[PDB]
Amino acid sequence: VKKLINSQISLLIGKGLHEFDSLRDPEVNDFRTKMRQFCEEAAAHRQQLGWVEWLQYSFPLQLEPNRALLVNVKFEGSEESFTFQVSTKDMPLALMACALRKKATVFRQQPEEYALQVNGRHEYLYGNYPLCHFQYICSCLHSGLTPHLTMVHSSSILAMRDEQSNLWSLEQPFSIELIEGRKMKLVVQAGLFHGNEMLCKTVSSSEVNVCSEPVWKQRLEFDISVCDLPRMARLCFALYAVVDCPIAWANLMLFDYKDQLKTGERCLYMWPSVLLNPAGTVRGNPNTESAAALVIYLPEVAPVYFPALEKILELLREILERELYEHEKDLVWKMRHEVQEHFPEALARLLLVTKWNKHEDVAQMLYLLCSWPELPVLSALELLDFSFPDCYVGSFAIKSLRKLTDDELFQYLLQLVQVLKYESYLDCELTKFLLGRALANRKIGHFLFWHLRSEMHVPSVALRFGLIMEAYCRGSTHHMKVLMKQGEALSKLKALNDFVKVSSQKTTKPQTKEMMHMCMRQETYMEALSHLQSPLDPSTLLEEVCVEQCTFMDSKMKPLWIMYSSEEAGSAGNVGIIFKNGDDLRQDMLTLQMIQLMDVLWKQEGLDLRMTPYGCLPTGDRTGLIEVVLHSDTIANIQLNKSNMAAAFNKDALLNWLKSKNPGEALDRAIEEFTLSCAGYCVATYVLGIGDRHSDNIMIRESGQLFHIDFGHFLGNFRVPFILTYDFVHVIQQGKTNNSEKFERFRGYCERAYTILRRHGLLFLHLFALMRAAGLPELSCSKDIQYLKDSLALGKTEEEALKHFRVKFNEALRES
């Protein structure tokens, strides 16, 4: 019985559990235990949660940041439905109060015992809040569509819970003896690093010939006392050749995870190259066989652990804040004590002057860290940055981070996961925290898994991600079932796309399309492809898959197009997803995630650019899912101006198009939608650098809202300036050649959107800092990020920045 599970875990996480054991690594062994029971006691807690507390776990709310409204309401055991009229300002209960009395009359005669399940979705309606504060309601009301809810009893929501049954004396210089290696001449650079910059000095070595397997036994000496290496400090090797050609690199913690200094001899299996790399990880390559190892000797010292801590309890400027000439590092460190007293939110600037190479400053720096008032989240995001490796800051950072909402957590989740690659050991506070939150919220649970599942093909993180995944599973056995269902859909889809690629090679679109439909209609594909939660959205219920509607785009990686339909969800149950295999999909997810962040900040200052935030989810190696936006066409299609329709100038295709989708008065609103979304995405794509936009990767929806697809290009990689296209300019202007009233309302939208993002310019900056961890080729250098500072123009005055933004815009009308 524990063997079925372990086995289902191996399947699910993409690595066999037996590969852990088989490592005889003690660090990994107590990781697996200290975490198995954090997680099971977490689940313990879970199966005794109250019923509403269960709803808040399995189906956490969806929420937006005077008039009336129609709502069909059901019950479980039946199909009889009543329509209502409630306003947008009622609570969920008014509805339920009113829902039972129209029953208490048919069945011929207590609203607090209930919840409104949205229909054919794992979404529910309950709480403090008005009706239109809800993400579904304020959404059905635009679409003007009737909400369809279900009165689900407390007895029913406990039934589901039930189902989910589970020292400092050493003052000589530190040095290593080099030994052998196993792949002109050969060089071996080595630095002592803490975070970003180095403690000691650069230390090359004896030259040898590429005649190698080489042997060095040169005693390599480092410029720093031993009593003064910090608790971290990573030692950082690098192997090249000249008469410079990079070869491999390798890092390692100078201390045991269990705290003690590292002696004495060990073997370093190195990762290759492309030139000395403090940021790569401090575990070694799994490729044992192929891998160039390096062997060194970490010398002896008597069993010196690293001192616990009541015994580091030992001990006009401000044209300053928010790079130095550090004839100013002084006054910062000098009067550090009332930095803490009178300026707490500059903790970071301080750590970035603290001496890590000498333990007296560190002990003193840490001394102010424990008394430090906690920070605002924006600040804690800063401290996660690589250049604050320190266990303690990271503890402080995590400490200040518990004041996150599950909503903001979900909003920064992709970065926090990237941060997991910096961590120097396995059992860190961030991991404990993420699993804590994840186990405590099933939407968080969902997306944490997939952020990890999607990287198990990358050797540098397969072990850690694997390890956490398994823990998550030990604490959520049921949710493991639901994720298998998903991973199997994706397994099959992949096979089906392989077939579609191959088949399309030798035959026509109707033939391959009709062939695919049979592949699908096999018993095995119908079972796998149906009746699962959507990896893109766990409240979306992919149920009965419509094969007649499935197709594939006749382009290079032949993405698939899968429609679905729930009968107990009606029209809002007919949804689709896109399978794409071939491309790395992490670039887009980042882009769509940031854009969605833009729509939140704008909405939080009362500005709705009617944006369009479709899910994008990478699931595996160059493989992931994209969410389908029904009722939408590419501009490029629309502008082909074909015959059929009911356009004398190509300029008018788009507008005519718009007209035919919105006759009578509805064309007013669509133009408006159009104008708003076009302001959003124009500013979105200008701030972010999104390149070569053309009518093939811009889509418009019948409502009018336009949105962008295919985000390959990013942060102005080929300075990307503002773009305004004549033919949306022509739609904005309702047809007219000279509609300055409608066009400048449009310029304002843009200016507002731009200024609102500028006041959070720092959030985006902190968030792009952490993503540097992600290996995204168009996001690695220090000055890919300066693109975002000169976009946001964050170093100018608000009246000045908007001066220059105004130049950029005006030059972009001028193209048309």
Given the rule CB under 6 A, which residues bind ligand 68R?
Answer: 551-553, 559, 561, 578, 588, 614, 626-629, 632-634, 637, 709-710
CB of 633 to ligand 68R, least distance (A): 5
For residue 654, give both structure tokens: 């788009």
CB of 516 to ligand 68R, least distance (A): 11
Residue with tokens 């679109």: 509
Output 626 or 679, the one with its CB closest to ligand 68R: 626
* Cβ contact 383:348 at 8 Å: yes
At 325, which amino acid appears? Y
d(CA 605, CA 536): 28
DSSP characters for 560-618? Answer: EEEEEEBGGGBGGG--EEEEEESS--HHHHHHHHHHHHHHHHHHTTT---------EEE
d(CA 268, CA 181): 9
Nearby residues of 652 by Cβ (< 8 Å), 6 or more positions away: 730, 735
d(CA 441, CA 433): 12
CB of 482 to ligand 68R, least distance (A): 24
Output 157 or 562, the one with its CB closest to ligand 68R: 562
Nearby residues of 424 by Cβ (< 8 Å), 6 or more positions away: 232, 234, 253, 282, 389
CB of 646 to ligand 68R, least distance (A): 20
Output 590 or 757, the one with its CB closest to ligand 68R: 590
CB of 558 to ligand 68R, least distance (A): 8
Q: How many CA atoms lie within 13 A of 319 on its CB side?
A: 3
CB of 713 to ligand 68R, least distance (A): 12
* Cβ contact 394:428 at 8 Å: yes
Provide the 8-state DSSP code for 772: G
CB of 621 to ligand 68R, least distance (A): 17
CB of 59 to ligand 68R, least distance (A): 24
CB of 736 to ligand 68R, least distance (A): 28
Q: How many other CB atoms are found less than 10 A from the CB of residue 621?
A: 14
Output 579 or 686, the one with its CB closest to ligand 68R: 579
CB of 636 to ligand 68R, least distance (A): 8
Exposed, middle or buried, 211 (CB in 10 Å: 0-12/13-18/19+)? exposed
Angle at which helix 509-520 crosses helix 477-506, to 10 degrees, equals 150
- Tell me which residue of 4, 13, 12, 5 sits closest to 40, measured CA to CA: 5
CB of 582 to ligand 68R, least distance (A): 11
DSSP characters for 457-512? Answer: TSTTTHHHHHHHHHHHHHT-HHHHHHHHHHHHHHHHHHHHHHHHHHHHHHS-HHHH
Task: Give, for 628, the enclosing helix (H) or strand (E).
Answer: none
For residue 722, give both structure tokens: 């503002």
Strand bridging mode 532-534 / 271-272: unpaired
CB of 417 to ligand 68R, least distance (A): 21
Output 313 or 553, the one with its CB closest to ligand 68R: 553
- Tell me which residue of 431, 411, 308 sits closest to 28, measured CA to CA: 431
Output 57 or 707, the one with its CB closest to ligand 68R: 707
Question: From start to end of 279-426, where are the E strands?
Answer: 293-298
Estimate to the nearest angstrom the gap between the alpha carbon of 754 and the chain centroid.
23
d(CA 490, CA 738): 52
Output 60 or 559, the one with its CB closest to ligand 68R: 559
- Tell me which residue of 589, 602, 569, 681 sits closest to 136, measured CA to CA: 569
Output 57 or 552, the one with its CB closest to ligand 68R: 552
CB of 616 to ligand 68R, least distance (A): 6
Output 235 or 575, the one with its CB closest to ligand 68R: 575
Question: From start to end of 106-253, where are the E strands?
Answer: 114-118, 124-125, 148-153, 173-181, 185-193, 208-209, 219-225, 234-240, 248-253
CB of 774 to ligand 68R, least distance (A): 18
Output 721 or 777, the one with its CB closest to ligand 68R: 777
Output 698 or 757, the one with its CB closest to ligand 68R: 698
Residue with tokens 């048919």: 106
Output 423 or 627, the one with its CB closest to ligand 68R: 627
Output 40 or 537, the one with its CB closest to ligand 68R: 537
For residue 406, give both structure tokens: 């599950």
CA torsion through residues 614, 618, 622, 623, sign: negative
CB of 211 to ligand 68R, least distance (A): 50
Task: Give, for 665, the enclosing helix (H) or strand (E).
Answer: none
CB of 561 to ligand 68R, least distance (A): 4
Output 486 or 512, the one with its CB closest to ligand 68R: 512
CA distances from 581 to 64, 558, 592 (A): 33, 8, 19
Output 297 or 614, the one with its CB closest to ligand 68R: 614
Output 129 or 561, the one with its CB closest to ligand 68R: 561
